[PDB]
Amino acid sequence: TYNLAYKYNFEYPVVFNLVLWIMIGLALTLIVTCYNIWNMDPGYDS
Amino acid sequence: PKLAACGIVLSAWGVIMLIMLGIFFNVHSAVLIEDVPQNIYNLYEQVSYNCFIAASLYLLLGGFS
Amino acid sequence: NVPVSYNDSYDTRILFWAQNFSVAYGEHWEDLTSRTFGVQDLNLTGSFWNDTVARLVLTYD
Amino acid sequence: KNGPEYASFFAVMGASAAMVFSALGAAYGTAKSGTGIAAMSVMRPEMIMKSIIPVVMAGIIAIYGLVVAVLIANSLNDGISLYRSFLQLGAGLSVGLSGLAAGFAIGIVGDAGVRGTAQQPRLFVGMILILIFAEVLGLYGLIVALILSTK
Amino acid sequence: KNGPEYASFFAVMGASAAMVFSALGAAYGTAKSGTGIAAMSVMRPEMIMKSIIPVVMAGIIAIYGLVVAVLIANSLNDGISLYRSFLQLGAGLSVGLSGLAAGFAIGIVGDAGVRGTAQQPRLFVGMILILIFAEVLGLYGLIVALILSTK
Amino acid sequence: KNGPEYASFFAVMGASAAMVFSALGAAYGTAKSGTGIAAMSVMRPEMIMKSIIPVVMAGIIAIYGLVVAVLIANSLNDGISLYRSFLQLGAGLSVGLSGLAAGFAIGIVGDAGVRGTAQQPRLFVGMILILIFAEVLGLYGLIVALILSTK
Amino acid sequence: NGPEYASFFAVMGASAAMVFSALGAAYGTAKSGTGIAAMSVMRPEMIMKSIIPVVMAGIIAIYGLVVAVLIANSLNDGISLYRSFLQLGAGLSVGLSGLAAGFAIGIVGDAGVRGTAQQPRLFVGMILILIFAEVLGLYGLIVALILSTK
Amino acid sequence: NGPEYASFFAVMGASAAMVFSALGAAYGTAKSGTGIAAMSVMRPEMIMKSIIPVVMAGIIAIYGLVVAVLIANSLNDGISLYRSFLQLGAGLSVGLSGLAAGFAIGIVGDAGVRGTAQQPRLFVGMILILIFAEVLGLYGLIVALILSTK
Amino acid sequence: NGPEYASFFAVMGASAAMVFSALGAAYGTAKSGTGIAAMSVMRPEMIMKSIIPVVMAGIIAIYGLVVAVLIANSLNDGISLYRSFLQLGAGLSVGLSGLAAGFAIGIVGDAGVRGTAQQPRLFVGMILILIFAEVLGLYGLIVALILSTK
Amino acid sequence: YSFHCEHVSSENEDGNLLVPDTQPSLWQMTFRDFQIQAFNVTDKKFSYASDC
Amino acid sequence: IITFPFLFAVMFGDLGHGILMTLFAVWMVLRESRILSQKNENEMFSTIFSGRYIILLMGVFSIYTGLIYNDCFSKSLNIFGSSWSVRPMFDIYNWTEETLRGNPVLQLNPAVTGVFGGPYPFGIDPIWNIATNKLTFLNSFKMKMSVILGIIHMLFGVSLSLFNHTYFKKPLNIYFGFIPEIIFMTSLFGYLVILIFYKWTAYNAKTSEKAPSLLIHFINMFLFSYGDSGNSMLYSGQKGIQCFLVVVALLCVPWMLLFKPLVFGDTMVHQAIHTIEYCLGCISNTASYLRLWALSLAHAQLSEVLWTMVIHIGLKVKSLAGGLALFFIFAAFATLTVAILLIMEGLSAFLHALRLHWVEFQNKFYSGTGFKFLPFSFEHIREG
Amino acid sequence: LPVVIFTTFWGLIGIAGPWFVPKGPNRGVIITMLVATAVCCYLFWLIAILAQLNPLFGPQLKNETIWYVRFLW
Ligand SMILES: CO/C1=C/C(C)=C\[C@@H](C)[C@@H](O)[C@H](C)C/C(C)=C/C=C/[C@H](OC)[C@@H]([C@@H](C)[C@@H](O)[C@H](C)[C@@]2(O)C[C@@H](O)[C@H](C)[C@@H](C(C)C)O2)OC1=O
Ligand SMILES: CO/C1=C\C(C)=C/[C@@H](C)[C@@H](O)[C@H](C)C/C(C)=C\C=C\[C@H](OC)[C@@H]([C@@H](C)[C@@H](O)[C@H](C)[C@@]2(O)C[C@@H](O)[C@H](C)[C@@H](C(C)C)O2)OC1=O
Ligand SMILES: CO/C1=C\C(C)=C\[C@@H](C)[C@@H](O)[C@H](C)C/C(C)=C/C=C\[C@H](OC)[C@@H]([C@@H](C)[C@@H](O)[C@H](C)[C@@]2(O)C[C@@H](O)[C@H](C)[C@@H](C(C)C)O2)OC1=O
Ligand SMILES: CO/C1=C\C(C)=C\[C@@H](C)[C@@H](O)[C@H](C)C/C(C)=C/C=C\[C@H](OC)[C@@H]([C@@H](C)[C@@H](O)[C@H](C)[C@@]2(O)C[C@@H](O)[C@H](C)[C@@H](C(C)C)O2)OC1=O
Ligand SMILES: CCCCCCCC/C=C\CCCCCCCC(=O)O
Ligand SMILES: *[C@@H]1O[C@H](CO)[C@@H](O)[C@H](O)[C@H]1NC(C)=O
Ligand SMILES: *[C@@H]1O[C@H](CO)[C@@H](O)[C@H](O)[C@H]1NC(C)=O
Ligand SMILES: *[C@@H]1O[C@H](CO)[C@@H](O)[C@H](O)[C@H]1NC(C)=O
């Protein structure tokens, strides 16, 4: 009577794809933003 | 010149700081119980024996400098 | 509390657990998880086993 | 009544991204225009206190994100509904990424607007009028975060 | 009749993406064509207030996304159907990414137009004629976002 | 008769892509071939209004996508079959990616055309005859989207 | 209480409040530290008045170390999934908004100390821009406080 | 006791405490080691005094050694999932904050010894900015000892 | 014993200790060895004096070989998952820290031998920097011996 | 392996696993948890679960 | 002269470094005769010697605030105290020898009789330094005291702006520049420092485990949403008085704006900047005083890591600890506590006690366009 | 109670402080130095003895430090 399954919720493909395609949509938006401020090129001789 | 000059102010601090560490371990202070691996008081004085022979060892560096 | 467990030999066979077995005829909802996995005395009339076909019959009266 | 246990994840990501993406816009408006102060001030020292208007107008962008990052963080309860937490997610992106654009525009037109005032002082009343249009992009995104999050 | 729990995600995304991508287009129109005002200012400073036309054209792009971020966020209920929220996802994308394109076209023509007006004053009637064509790209996305949000 | 609850995702994604991808092609042909107006305006200012055809012909690209995206948004219905909604995703890709690429060729030929007409005015009937062939490409995507959406 | 993997998102808020904040404090020190080395060959008297963008950028690491202590002291066994997501958003909003304030100090403090060598009037104006560039790291702190008390 | 895979996150914090801190200690030694060669052809007397910015980067490596020894001595088969998540965040916050601290040392130590060749007065000012970029690795030490020993 | 897939993570610690310390030793002998060729045209005397960055880059390769033999001799059919996680992190700790140390040797050893072509006073200073880039592989060794021999 | 799912209810909304043969069905049932195994039950307990 | 070494001492407070900071400074003032005989040295002895009296007052003040919270090289002292007593915990709570296993970290109980009596005559009791929940007490104390020092130093700065008007005889400037400024600060922020003082005296450990939070009730003043059973009210009639204290501050924005320009286009727009740099600036100035809590925490945490990792390995050795081990441990410890814990922490606390005067104190009264006197004299020609 | 003791022992300086001051040219500075030292240092003590008065927590002690100060206090 032992060895019951781990109880994944029924909406597991929804919550997996809501987290995955946001946290790599907010990481690519973060990486592209911090890439442009790192390489700013203000112009500095004077 | 400066390595001879920096050594005396470190030794003058080395005798002041480590003597007071010797007296604070002789009185068996309750704040310093992390450094101890009536019987426990004897370990405290042992560290005070340890500190003092290094506090006196900084006097030799003062005379050498 | 424990799952339903049918056996024909000394070895055990098909076994089935649920947390809320509930049925409805028309619009009357009747919960049956208190008569199934706790009562320990089920009417498993023909619970077949053949290693390629198995049936689990639960009857409630 | 009470939502699921994962439901407050999306409302927290609307609270952080309303401050992360709006500080990343206000950092571009401060850095790109503030380097324009360092090049202008070598030849015209009298205009170092009138040219800090593009760095105070990019500082309102981070205030636009801080207000709704607090306002989202007060509507956070244990077990909020999944509908109520997507509103905080949709309010955080619509003010962070909107203030990221508003801080990128203020940095560009604030940089050129103070490179040009060192050669033409009549530009300075026109530089404010473009810095007003580039600032209300953070204000337009604010009043969508005020409408979305308060439902 | 009632929609699922995750159904409100796609409509609060179209509320944000109508404001995020239209402010990202209005900021490109303000930055790229605000760089050109500082280039025409150093030689022809009478045409400063008359050259704010390419940045008031990009300001209408920002309020195209503000209207349908209010039209979507006021049409939100808990448990809206999955069809009724998919309508307001494409109503947010077809006006954000249309105003994003129409802001790339305003900022490029507004940059070359006000730098060519400094050397040829007969271009100002032509630049303001191209900016009508580049502003109705955000308007064609507005009248397809209103026809999607209302149903 | 009633399809799945996510069936209307693919039709609105075709109504969005019919307007988004056409506005990107209409903004390329306006910004690229409107940059070419300001280069020929400085020396040959009498050919300004005659050379607004490559931003007019790039504006008909956007009204090809507006006609399809209105027909998809009017043929939308709660509980559409999964067959009928993919017919309007293929109708959105047929006029979306057509107007994206046909609006690219109006930009490149229109920018190269108005600079080669201002020096050799015999090329004006030769520029408009290449732009016609790049504008019927946007109409091949239109009249195959009218077949698919009304199928 | 909560599940066993609930304490992962809270220690990713204690780490990312120190990783992403010491990365912003490193960029404000490195990009402006080359501003001191290029300036001082011309004007070697301002190497004590002009290290103030380095000292200002040494607070972005301290703003993240403070949040990484409130999170790592509120960690106990069996925190809920709700209370652990609050400490993840308190660690990103003070780390990635300290990465923003470390950019705007490192770019302004670089060019600001070149322009102070050629003209000493900029010192009142350069220190004023570093006020507006440091409060981006402070606004992320007071939204990390309002999340971590819940 | 905990699950079978629970020791994966604690050893990954024992490796990343040494991997990412040696990657910062190498960039502080390699980037400021090319600055010794460009300094050498002008001022040969400043050789032994310019080994200080690679000494400071050498302490970044032992900041990650005293956390990787600390994790790899407290390892046991069957540690809980909570206790091993604490040592994953103890190695990520002392490695990636020593990678940032070693980045800023290699940049102000490279440019600092370029300006020391043209002017010897910068050497007391270069050694000040090397301290402020050193404590970014020390701030990651004091948040690693909080997370690991608790 | 343990599961059937358990020996995968120990083999990927035996091979990552080798192929990442051989990539560090590749960059050590190739980037410094291309500086010996540019030094040789004007100073052909100190050719044998300049194999020291190439020798100390080969020490990094035998640091990874010792751990990879030590891991591959501690393998059994059916080890625990805890033991094979220990040797994965013992392979990354000497592989990816030897890749950092071998990158640092190849950079300062390249600029060092091009600096001793124009001034031989750098030679006693070039070797003293390379010991600091040598011990980053040695620190990765003594954490790999601690992790694997548990 | 065994099966496990969280909703094996009837009354088809999007993806409910128990579908009736004719749609005006009088019977409806609902499992808020579910775990069944056949043909390899060993030692009177479930195996690893092939989840739904 | 007082408040700048005092604000340096709240964020750099240590009795051990309070000894070293003044002993470096007493050496620079008692031996200053032979130092003026020398021409010049490096700027680590030229700029430091020019401020030899500033560092002297930073030493004697940080001995005091390095005694309030005990913190002497992160070690603490007993002067007639330790009011937390562990022995009643073993007796009345029926709390036997189980300490060994079970729970290895055990927390005391203040509500049971005998454990806490008297709040330790002078300062912070040293039971916290040997506790492991030390930081969750200090962060409730050092943060709330960073606003108490942040309001009464900024209310003192606006009280010096009244005499900038009544001496120059500009009584118009009082009724829009001092009276609505002191109403806007006392109703919002001067109520906050008496809301912090209220929670210290009202709630004890016996009653009110459901204690209110001061973060929420301050935000719920601005956001008018009142009524929720999560956070109980601090006192009776809180919805009555706090709605009054916010609406008296709301009318101060028209009181500063609409009633000054009646004397026009540039005194309405450019002098609205004088209101909005005070309107949203006063909130961002109060929160800017949290940097004397962050620096006080980062200095107190750096003092542990040089003791419990450098000194402790030289101390916790069984047989040969104080011999050849501790001679080289302390000589490397004395270099690490000077170069890190006294130079950069003494310079990080130096600037952020200085920028709190330039921006958060000299913006309320100090305008400062200025022109220096520079009298013609021969004091340039001293010896060279 | 030291609260009624230290209110006048830090109240001597600042009230009897300006009463006994020499008539030199440093009167306006030394009185400012004596009064502000009495205001800052006493209020620093005042907001520290009020934090521990009516507390809410207890010192979480290590296990070796459960039985140790029973012999020491
Ligand atoms: C203060 O008003 C402003 C308002 C803002 C922020 C937003 C909306 C109103 C706008 O987003 C809406 C959408 C568009 C619209 C209608 C704006 C009017 C703008 C102002 O007015 C043009 C100009 C103003 C500079 C402009 O007015 C010039 C003074 C000018 O008068 C000079 C003329 O030579 C110029 C040709 C003429 C044209 C541009 C309208 O206006 O700025 C402004 O900040
Ligand atoms: C004012 O904006 C105009 C139209 C706008 C706002 C709105 C949408 C419907 C439009 O968005 C879409 C693009 C309409 C469309 C697809 C063409 C309409 C074209 C007009 O009809 C030629 C020209 C054109 C008449 C005119 O602009 C030029 C004066 C000119 O006529 C001068 C001629 O000498 C030149 C030869 C001629 C070309 C067209 C033959 O261009 O403009 C406009 O009125
Ligand atoms: C190469 O062998 C040396 C160290 C090695 C190999 C260290 C590692 C293996 C690792 O085990 C150690 C732990 C890395 C480490 C923590 C070194 C600390 C200090 C030493 O002490 C300054 C210098 C020092 C004795 C000396 O090399 C420098 C030449 C010098 O110190 C002396 C002077 O020229 C110069 C004036 C001084 C400056 C900057 C004041 O730098 O390490 C050595 O020598
Ligand atoms: C067999 O391959 C050689 C070494 C190999 C492959 C070693 C591996 C087993 C490796 O695992 C390591 C690197 C073992 C090791 C550490 C050898 C060190 C030096 C070698 O010596 C023993 C040099 C050395 C004799 C010689 O090559 C140089 C000419 C020189 O003798 C001349 C001196 O001017 C020079 C300064 C001195 C320095 C470079 C050591 O070495 O050679 C070799 O042949
Ligand atoms: C769930 C949301 C995740 C997806 C959101 C993506 C939206 C992206 C928004 C902005 C990214 C653009 C930032 C790059 C700035 C460009 C700089 C430049 O071109 O000068
Ligand atoms: C199940 O096994 C037990 C134990 O051998 C046996 O007594 C019982 O009769 C079996 N069940 C059936 C229905 O035969
Ligand atoms: C689920 O089970 C609980 C008790 O186990 C019961 O009270 C409840 O009625 C069940 N759900 C339904 C829908 O019957
Ligand atoms: C098992 O039983 C089923 C149903 O009675 C039957 O169809 C099948 O042939 C049987 N198989 C064997 C191997 O007896």
CSV table of N, CA and C in Angstrom, one decimal, chain D residues 72-133:
chain,number,residue,atom,x,y,z
D,72,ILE,N,2.3,47.3,-5.8
D,72,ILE,CA,2.1,45.9,-6.0
D,72,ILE,C,2.5,45.1,-4.7
D,73,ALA,N,3.5,45.6,-4.0
D,73,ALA,CA,4.0,44.9,-2.8
D,73,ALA,C,3.0,45.0,-1.6
D,74,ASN,N,2.0,45.9,-1.7
D,74,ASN,CA,1.0,46.0,-0.7
D,74,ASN,C,-0.2,45.1,-1.0
D,75,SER,N,-0.4,44.8,-2.3
D,75,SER,CA,-1.5,43.9,-2.7
D,75,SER,C,-1.1,42.5,-2.7
D,76,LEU,N,-0.1,42.1,-2.0
D,76,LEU,CA,0.4,40.7,-1.9
D,76,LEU,C,-0.1,40.0,-0.6
D,77,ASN,N,-1.0,39.0,-0.8
D,77,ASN,CA,-1.5,38.3,0.3
D,77,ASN,C,-1.1,36.8,0.1
D,78,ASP,N,-1.2,36.1,1.2
D,78,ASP,CA,-0.9,34.6,1.2
D,78,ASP,C,-2.0,33.9,0.4
D,79,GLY,N,-1.7,33.4,-0.7
D,79,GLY,CA,-2.7,32.7,-1.5
D,79,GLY,C,-3.6,33.7,-2.3
D,80,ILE,N,-3.0,34.6,-3.0
D,80,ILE,CA,-3.8,35.4,-3.9
D,80,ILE,C,-4.2,34.6,-5.1
D,81,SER,N,-5.3,35.0,-5.7
D,81,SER,CA,-5.9,34.3,-6.9
D,81,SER,C,-4.9,34.4,-8.1
D,82,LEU,N,-5.0,33.5,-9.0
D,82,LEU,CA,-4.1,33.5,-10.1
D,82,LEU,C,-4.5,34.6,-11.1
D,83,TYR,N,-5.8,35.1,-11.1
D,83,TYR,CA,-6.1,36.3,-11.9
D,83,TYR,C,-5.5,37.5,-11.3
D,84,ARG,N,-5.5,37.6,-9.9
D,84,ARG,CA,-5.1,38.9,-9.3
D,84,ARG,C,-3.5,39.0,-9.3
D,85,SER,N,-2.8,37.9,-9.6
D,85,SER,CA,-1.4,38.0,-9.7
D,85,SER,C,-0.9,38.3,-11.1
D,86,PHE,N,-1.6,37.9,-12.1
D,86,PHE,CA,-1.3,38.3,-13.4
D,86,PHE,C,-1.5,39.8,-13.6
D,87,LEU,N,-2.4,40.4,-12.9
D,87,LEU,CA,-2.5,41.9,-13.0
D,87,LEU,C,-1.3,42.6,-12.4
D,88,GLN,N,-0.7,42.1,-11.4
D,88,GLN,CA,0.6,42.6,-10.9
D,88,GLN,C,1.7,42.3,-11.8
D,89,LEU,N,1.7,41.2,-12.5
D,89,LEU,CA,2.7,41.0,-13.5
D,89,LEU,C,2.5,41.9,-14.7
D,90,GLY,N,1.3,42.1,-15.2
D,90,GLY,CA,1.1,43.0,-16.3
D,90,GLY,C,1.3,44.4,-16.0
D,91,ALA,N,1.2,44.8,-14.7
D,91,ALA,CA,1.5,46.2,-14.3
D,91,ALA,C,3.0,46.4,-14.2
D,92,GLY,N,3.8,45.4,-13.8
D,92,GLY,CA,5.2,45.6,-13.6
D,92,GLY,C,5.9,45.7,-14.9
D,93,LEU,N,5.5,44.9,-15.9
D,93,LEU,CA,6.2,44.9,-17.2
D,93,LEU,C,5.8,46.2,-18.0
D,94,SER,N,4.6,46.7,-17.8
D,94,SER,CA,4.1,47.8,-18.5
D,94,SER,C,4.5,49.1,-17.9
D,95,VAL,N,5.3,49.1,-16.9
D,95,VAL,CA,6.0,50.3,-16.3
D,95,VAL,C,7.5,50.1,-16.3
D,96,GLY,N,8.0,48.9,-16.3
D,96,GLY,CA,9.5,48.7,-16.3
D,96,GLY,C,10.0,48.9,-17.7
D,97,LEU,N,9.4,48.1,-18.6
D,97,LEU,CA,9.8,48.1,-20.0
D,97,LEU,C,9.3,49.4,-20.7
D,98,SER,N,8.3,50.1,-20.2
D,98,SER,CA,7.9,51.4,-20.7
D,98,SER,C,8.8,52.5,-20.2
D,99,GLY,N,9.3,52.4,-18.9
D,99,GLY,CA,10.3,53.3,-18.4
D,99,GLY,C,11.7,52.9,-18.8
D,100,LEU,N,11.9,51.7,-19.3
D,100,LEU,CA,13.2,51.4,-19.9
D,100,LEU,C,13.3,52.1,-21.3
D,101,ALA,N,12.2,52.2,-22.0
D,101,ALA,CA,12.2,53.0,-23.3
D,101,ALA,C,12.3,54.5,-23.0
D,102,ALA,N,11.6,55.0,-22.0
D,102,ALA,CA,11.6,56.4,-21.6
D,102,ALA,C,12.9,56.8,-21.1
D,103,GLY,N,13.7,55.9,-20.4
D,103,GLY,CA,15.0,56.3,-20.0
D,103,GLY,C,16.1,56.1,-21.1
D,104,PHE,N,15.8,55.3,-22.1
D,104,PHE,CA,16.7,55.3,-23.2
D,104,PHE,C,16.5,56.5,-24.1
D,105,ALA,N,15.3,57.0,-24.3
D,105,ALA,CA,15.1,58.1,-25.1
D,105,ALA,C,15.6,59.4,-24.4
D,106,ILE,N,15.5,59.5,-23.1
D,106,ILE,CA,16.0,60.7,-22.4
D,106,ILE,C,17.5,60.7,-22.4
D,107,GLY,N,18.1,59.6,-22.4
D,107,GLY,CA,19.6,59.5,-22.5
D,107,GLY,C,20.1,59.9,-23.8
D,108,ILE,N,19.4,59.6,-24.9
D,108,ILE,CA,19.9,60.0,-26.2
D,108,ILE,C,19.7,61.5,-26.5
D,109,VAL,N,18.4,62.0,-26.3
D,109,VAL,CA,18.1,63.4,-26.6
D,109,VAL,C,18.7,64.3,-25.5
D,110,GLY,N,19.0,63.8,-24.3
D,110,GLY,CA,19.7,64.6,-23.3
D,110,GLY,C,21.1,64.7,-23.6
D,111,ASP,N,21.7,63.7,-24.2
D,111,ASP,CA,23.2,63.8,-24.6
D,111,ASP,C,23.4,64.8,-25.7
D,112,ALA,N,22.6,64.6,-26.8
D,112,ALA,CA,22.8,65.5,-27.9
D,112,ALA,C,22.3,66.9,-27.6
D,113,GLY,N,21.3,67.1,-26.7
D,113,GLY,CA,20.8,68.4,-26.3
D,113,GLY,C,21.7,69.2,-25.5
D,114,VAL,N,22.7,68.6,-24.8
D,114,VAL,CA,23.7,69.4,-24.1
D,114,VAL,C,25.0,69.4,-24.9
D,115,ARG,N,25.2,68.6,-25.9
D,115,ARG,CA,26.3,68.8,-26.8
D,115,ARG,C,26.0,70.0,-27.7
D,116,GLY,N,24.8,70.2,-28.0
D,116,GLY,CA,24.4,71.3,-28.9
D,116,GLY,C,24.2,72.6,-28.3
D,117,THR,N,23.9,72.7,-27.0
D,117,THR,CA,23.7,73.9,-26.3
D,117,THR,C,25.0,74.6,-26.0
D,118,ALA,N,26.1,73.9,-26.1
D,118,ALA,CA,27.5,74.5,-26.0
D,118,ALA,C,27.9,75.2,-27.2
D,119,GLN,N,27.1,75.1,-28.3
D,119,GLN,CA,27.4,75.8,-29.5
D,119,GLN,C,26.2,76.7,-30.0
D,120,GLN,N,25.0,76.5,-29.3
D,120,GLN,CA,23.8,77.3,-29.7
D,120,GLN,C,23.0,77.3,-28.4
D,121,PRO,N,23.0,78.4,-27.6
D,121,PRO,CA,22.2,78.5,-26.4
D,121,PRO,C,20.7,78.6,-26.7
D,122,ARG,N,20.3,78.9,-27.9
D,122,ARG,CA,18.8,78.9,-28.2
D,122,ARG,C,18.2,77.6,-28.3
D,123,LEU,N,19.0,76.5,-28.3
D,123,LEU,CA,18.5,75.1,-28.4
D,123,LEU,C,17.9,74.7,-27.0
D,124,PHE,N,18.2,75.4,-25.9
D,124,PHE,CA,17.9,74.9,-24.6
D,124,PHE,C,16.4,74.9,-24.3
D,125,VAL,N,15.7,75.9,-24.8
D,125,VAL,CA,14.2,75.8,-24.6
D,125,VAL,C,13.6,74.8,-25.5
D,126,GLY,N,14.3,74.3,-26.6
D,126,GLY,CA,13.8,73.2,-27.4
D,126,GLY,C,14.1,71.9,-26.8
D,127,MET,N,15.2,71.8,-26.1
D,127,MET,CA,15.7,70.6,-25.5
D,127,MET,C,14.7,70.1,-24.4
D,128,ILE,N,14.2,71.1,-23.6
D,128,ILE,CA,13.2,70.8,-22.6
D,128,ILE,C,11.9,70.2,-23.2
D,129,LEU,N,11.5,70.7,-24.4
D,129,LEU,CA,10.3,70.3,-25.0
D,129,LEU,C,10.3,68.9,-25.6
D,130,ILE,N,11.5,68.5,-26.0
D,130,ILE,CA,11.7,67.1,-26.3
D,130,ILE,C,11.8,66.2,-25.1
D,131,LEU,N,12.5,66.7,-24.1
D,131,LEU,CA,12.6,65.9,-22.8
D,131,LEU,C,11.3,65.9,-22.1
D,132,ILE,N,10.3,66.6,-22.4
D,132,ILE,CA,8.9,66.5,-21.9
D,132,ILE,C,8.2,65.3,-22.6
D,133,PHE,N,8.4,65.2,-23.9
D,133,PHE,CA,7.8,64.1,-24.7
D,133,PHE,C,8.4,62.8,-24.4
